[PDB]
Amino acid sequence: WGTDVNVAACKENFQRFLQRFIDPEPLYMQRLGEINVIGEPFLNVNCEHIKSFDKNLYRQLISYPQEVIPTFDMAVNEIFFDRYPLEHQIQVRPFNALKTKNMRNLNPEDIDQLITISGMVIRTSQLIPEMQEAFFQCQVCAHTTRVEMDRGRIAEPSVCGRCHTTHSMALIHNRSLFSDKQMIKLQESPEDMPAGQTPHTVILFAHNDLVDKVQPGDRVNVTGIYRAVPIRVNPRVSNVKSVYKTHIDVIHYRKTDFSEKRVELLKELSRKPDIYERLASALAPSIYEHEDIKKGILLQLFGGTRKDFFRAEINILLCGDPGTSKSQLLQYVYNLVPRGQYTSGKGSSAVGLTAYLVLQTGALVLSDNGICCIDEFDKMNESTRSVLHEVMEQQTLSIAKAGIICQLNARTSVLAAANPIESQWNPKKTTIENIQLPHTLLSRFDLIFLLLDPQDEAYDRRLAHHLVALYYQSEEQAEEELLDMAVLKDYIAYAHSTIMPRLSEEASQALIEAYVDMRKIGSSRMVSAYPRQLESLIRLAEAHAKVRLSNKVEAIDVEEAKRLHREALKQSATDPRTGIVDISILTTGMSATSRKRKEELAEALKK
Amino acid sequence: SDQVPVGNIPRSITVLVEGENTRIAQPGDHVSVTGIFLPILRTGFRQVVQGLLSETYLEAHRIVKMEELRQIAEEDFYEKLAASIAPEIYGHEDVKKALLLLLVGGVDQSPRGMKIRGNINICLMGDPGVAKSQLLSYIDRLAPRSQYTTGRGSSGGALVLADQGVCCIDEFDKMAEADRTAIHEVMEQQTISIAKAGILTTLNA
Amino acid sequence: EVRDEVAEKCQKLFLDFLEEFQSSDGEIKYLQLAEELIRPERNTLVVSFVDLEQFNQQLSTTIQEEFYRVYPYLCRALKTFVKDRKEIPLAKDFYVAFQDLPTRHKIRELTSSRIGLLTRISGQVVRTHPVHPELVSGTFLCLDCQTVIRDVEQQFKYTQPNICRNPVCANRRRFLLDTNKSRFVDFQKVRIQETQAELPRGSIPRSLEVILRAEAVESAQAGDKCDFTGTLIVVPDVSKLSTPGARAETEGIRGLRALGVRDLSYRLVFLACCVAPTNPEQTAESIKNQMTVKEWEKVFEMSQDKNLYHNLCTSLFPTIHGNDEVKRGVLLMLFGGVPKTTGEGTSLRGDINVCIVGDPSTAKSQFLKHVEE
DNA sequence: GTGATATCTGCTTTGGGTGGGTGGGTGGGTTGAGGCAATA
DNA sequence: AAGCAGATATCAC
Ligand SMILES: Nc1ncnc2c1ncn2[C@@H]1O[C@H](COP(=O)(O)OP(=O)(O)OP(=O)(O)O)[C@@H](O)[C@H]1O
């Protein structure tokens, strides 16, 4: 072999490295102790440490990884068995903290050398079995033999040892020994790409415990050996092309993006009198002065109680003029939730809402037990509207296509954003006629909010100052906001984990009286409420109880739910002509005054 | 294009590059290649089946890509530079000034080094024959990295090649919905998202 | 001939288990089930793994660790256990299924270390393929000496005898397949997918190929969520392999004689012996028979109740207040009329249609949902 | 003198349209123009 | 040109 590698000297040097190196008790001695405690036989070693201690050992590791790494394994095994008298022997995984190469600059001089590259995973293959030891059985005497694989070639026996028959040994594929392999496609990082060039892609091969350690979408630093392999002209001939193909044999992956103390902090927050407003403020610091919308979105994030007999999910629609902060709110909620999806109602959209050989479930099914953010709600076609109505009413999605008949669970909360059909919101027009959506679909939303653009000058000045301040915000404030967001996420996770509020007797009486009063308002003069709204109240009440980290729904929760529902209706249920109390616009899609006027017109034309 | 004979289609040649002549040429550059014109050797049974005809290639040997100044910068330089945009066009003084801003493009970073969008978007709406296409054609020739496209000349790519550049969209109201969605997302996120049967990918735009 | 000690011991112990294992009632549990295997359409016996674990833990462990190796011997033991009854032809083949495996694995846990072991998985069926006959043991005639060779095993590829049985004969290339004395099994290929519950967050679904055999064919439908019990195996690239009777048809391992200068790759498929749903000619007498005694007396009491119309109405729709007439109508729809056919071949409808016109939020959707559930 | 075992000989391959659309597209090949059903 | 199937003469023991 053309290598200046003496195995014994390398092993001794590496054992010396483990014994004496100190991180600026040897660090890797502590690592071996932790290995014994945990039981995972993998030792990661930073190549920078090896370089610092020994520049020859580092140089040999980089130049001849295939020869040198096994000697490192031998050294670590010997040392570890001395210090602590395990399913497998420990395996060293040298790695570089930072990439040493760009995917675009890989060269022939790097073949069979240890390199580190950064990238984003796009595809991973299913597991590929590799034969390590073949199993043969004589087709006459049943005598069995085992042959070790040698550089991808197997020495098939020619004569049975026991009975001496020739050409009688058949390979039993499923009695052999196999190991795992996986193909991964790594895409060049957007930052390192030259301007205007398409991303480059590289092939990686992972084996044994490194399979399935990355998923598509991951951003990773990969340390491995650069390989060059010949390509056959066709499968039948032994001719090869003079230009070789390349891949990387993965050696190390680095993914580059409750505690009792944490629970104590969360409970301490939950004890504070104004936890509701604190969480609401933390929800979206950038948006300005949309307090009730933020409170509703917080309650949607917490959700109501899963009774398991009843949708427990809270649906919110934000309709308003263009140039407001609707998309920003949807983005902030999408970032916050763990199982959320951000999508658009337009059909041309990259990510679809509908389920469509591989069965592909849409965003609504993917957001099951989560929140689906739908940005261009008004731009949905009729089929998408039917799908959304089915999801919101039944919490399931039925498919009968290509011989597949099934029902998919979709228990998802919809946060939707809507714009008017005109260039601006029309005060003369109601909500239904401002946004061209069926009233049947609108009646499935618990809360509808209106984000109108004021004509006030003082509002313009205040918003301008807000935006300028944000344009000049400092890094410490941004970090503080990030910490508050993390606290909010942990609080919501804990509440979902351990809190299941239930209705107390006083809450029940409060809800019944609330519904009766809402009905009375209309009954005094029309109808001012319908039973579905009562259900909404219950959900909201439960959500509020969950914010306090309380297992009992109290009267305060009911009062808050009533206030929020009454504010949303006052925002979105107002008839531009006369007043608000009329909810017939939601139930029938036509204003009561409009209905009377149309009746008059029809009667007159009938005259 | 200017060298193709009348009523013909441009031809192409294959260039094989080795060693230190690599990484010199990129798509889109104008190059002068010195090399050797050779036939492609077949192999195996394909030698026998194919006759006396051969494909060709060029074996690359050399690839070649193809205080007065302060005084010009010192005085009334904004007016002078704007007036120099398409001088053969008359009367669009303020539009020409706006197009110069689109070329410099505004500051890309916040005061703290955070990345912010500097690119400036302009739309020229007007009645026919007011030199809209002439102005767009001029900006394409001046811009170092740019792509000119028509509403129906291409659909379903030019944006990627125009990254860090200028994308001149002529006949902007003739495009389809799919093309409109792509333009909308570029003016929002400065990227293009594609989905190959569920395999997502994001490109810089 | 060399003898596989482990497999023979497993066969003997499995025969003992089939003969001796006792149910709660004191009868032999599987004798009465094997008694059903006299029918031509029945060839599979379903055995609970918990019963086997109770009977003999070492046997259960050996079966779990060497399932692929020992399964033919378990089938032979079943054949012996059925041999007594006269109605079975000597040519019939019998197969064993294993029902209740306590532990479950995920589709992404199917690694090389699981090859040949007994496993249980869950998945959603995406596609089903047509049923085929698959050769398991071929009978061949030797053209040189006219000797009949039987029980030639097949390994993923159409295989002919290696050497003629006759000691005097030296033939290695010329044989004739006789279909009528060969043994075939029903074969079906299905493609399944990860369930939405199992699919990791932000991950493309992983698909798997499952092979059903004998009775298991046509028992899973696309869109169903099913539990499969069986084993994970490797299937070689058949297209690369050349045999005396079968030429090769247009990296991996090298060096096999059947390979020439070619490479052999492998792919993982699941060989399922049992299929079940993940979440589980009629006449009045048969309906009664399907029921237990308690259920039958409950049905009779219901039939005798003099307030049955009202009790049924209230039981079906408990969440709805009022609207008794609507409940009565929906109940009558559920019971239905008598469909009839005329002498000339035309049909008289017997089904009942009902319509509910309602104001908003009046619980008509509640009626539809109650009926649907 | 029989059992390997080394040498020699003849077949057909390739994907391709002079090898067919009276083989078949579940055996496998971009680009455009042309009928459908559902669509708006 | 490249490679497998078949035929056949040839060394060795
Ligand atoms: N209330 C507000 N608080 C903070 N920023 C606001 C507010 N209203 C408008 N803005 C500013 O307006 C821009 C928000 O535009 P955004 O994309 O969120 O709008 P949108 O409501 O989704 O509307 P559309 O899609 O119709 O343009 C940002 O500059 C944001 O700073």
Ligand SMILES: Nc1ncnc2c1ncn2[C@@H]1O[C@H](COP(=O)(O)OP(=O)(O)OP(=O)(O)O)[C@@H](O)[C@H]1O
């Ligand atoms: N102000 C002008 N100065 C010089 N040439 C002009 C002027 N206005 C129009 N032209 C000439 O008129 C012809 C038409 O101009 P051009 O094609 O750019 O118009 P346009 O606005 O793009 O039209 P359309 O809307 O029909 O596509 C060109 O030759 C252009 O040179």
Ligand SMILES: Nc1ncnc2c1ncn2[C@@H]1O[C@H](COP(=O)(O)OP(=O)(O)OP(=O)(O)O)[C@@H](O)[C@H]1O
């Ligand atoms: N008579 C009733 N008894 C009990 N609950 C009722 C009654 N009427 C309405 N409800 C309540 O109203 C809700 C049922 O609304 P549902 O969706 O079924 O209405 P709908 O008739 O389909 O109307 P729409 O389609 O306009 O929404 C549930 O809360 C149900 O409890």
Ligand SMILES: [Mg+2]
């Ligand atoms: Mg928006």
Ligand SMILES: [Mg+2]
């Ligand atoms: Mg023009």
Ligand SMILES: [Mg+2]
């Ligand atoms: Mg309804």
Ligand SMILES: [Zn+2]
């Ligand atoms: Zn043998």
Ligand SMILES: [Zn+2]
């Ligand atoms: Zn014979």
